[PDB]
Design a protein around this ligand. Structure first.
Ligand SMILES: Nc1ccc(C[C@H](NNc2nc(-c3ccc(Cl)c(Cl)c3)cs2)C(=O)O)cc1[N+](=O)[O-]
Ligand SMILES: C[n+]1cn([C@@H]2O[C@H](COP(=O)(O)OP(=O)(O)O)[C@@H](O)[C@H]2O)c2nc(N)[nH]c(=O)c21
Length: 176
């Protein structure tokens, strides 16, 4: 009676706490693998924050660089301005979630690991994480479709960063 998704997904929370090492602040909330259970979760949280993150990742992949499926990967990063938290954040996040659970990138959705939203005073961020940063055709395909899906204007780019680079930041591998 329920409608299965192609993948099982897990929702993670992150609570900012500078007094603790980063991994200590991560919390696995719940998992789902049907359309019905996705909306049940989404609707519940909408009815029910700064410094914190939400992450939706395929089952078995933790939302961190250290994970085997993220180690060699990277992310398409969308940076919002401060006004867009009110206007665009919720729309962008839901549209991103639907890209994930609806496998919107066709054959290349296999490269998708998950998505993360950072709530930050400096400007909120939404990102789609993929598994191999050197996989140009997959990465660029995901970027092009994702940018279009969120309705972003052509000339202004979004960037793809390697996690290996982000982890050693003291730069983009791709733009779309
Ligand atoms: N790392 C960490 C450390 C401490 C806490 C506890 C705490 N807040 N917990 C909270 N849970 C929800 C919450 C959860 C699930 C659903 Cl379904 C809904 Cl509707 C709301 C909102 S607020 C606090 O403020 O100290 C939390 C975390 N963490 O990462 O989640
Ligand atoms: C995604 N991520 C973030 N951090 C740590 O979290 C810090 C901030 O990460 P951020 O919250 O993504 O960026 P922000 O500066 O806008 O808040 C980074 O300097 C990293 O040290 C991370 N640390 C580990 N070990 N693994 C991760 O996946 C990871």
């Amino acid at each position: 009676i329920k409608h299965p998704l192609q993948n099982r997904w897990a929702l993670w929370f992150f609570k900012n706490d500078k007094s603790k090492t980063w991994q200590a602040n991560l919390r696995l909330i719940s998992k789902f693998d049907t359309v019905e259970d996705f909306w049940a979760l989404y609707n519940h949280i909408q009815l029910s924050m700064p410094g914190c993150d939400y992450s939706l990742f395929k089952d078995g992949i933790e939302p961190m660089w250290e994970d085997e499926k993220n180690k060699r990967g990277g992310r398409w990063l969308i940076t919002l301005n401060k006004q867009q938290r009110r206007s665009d954040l919720d729309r962008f996040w839901l549209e991103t979630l639907l890209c994930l659970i609806g496998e919107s990138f066709d054959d290349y959705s296999d490269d998708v690991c998950g998505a993360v939203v950072n709530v930050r005073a400096k400007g909120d961020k939404i990102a789609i994480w993929t598994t191999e940063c050197e996989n140009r055709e997959a990465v660029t395909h995901i970027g092009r479709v994702y940018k279009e899906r969120l309705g972003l204007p052509p000339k202004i780019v979004i960037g793809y960063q390697s996690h290996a680079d982000t982890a050693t930041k003291s730069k983009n591998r791709f733009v779309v």
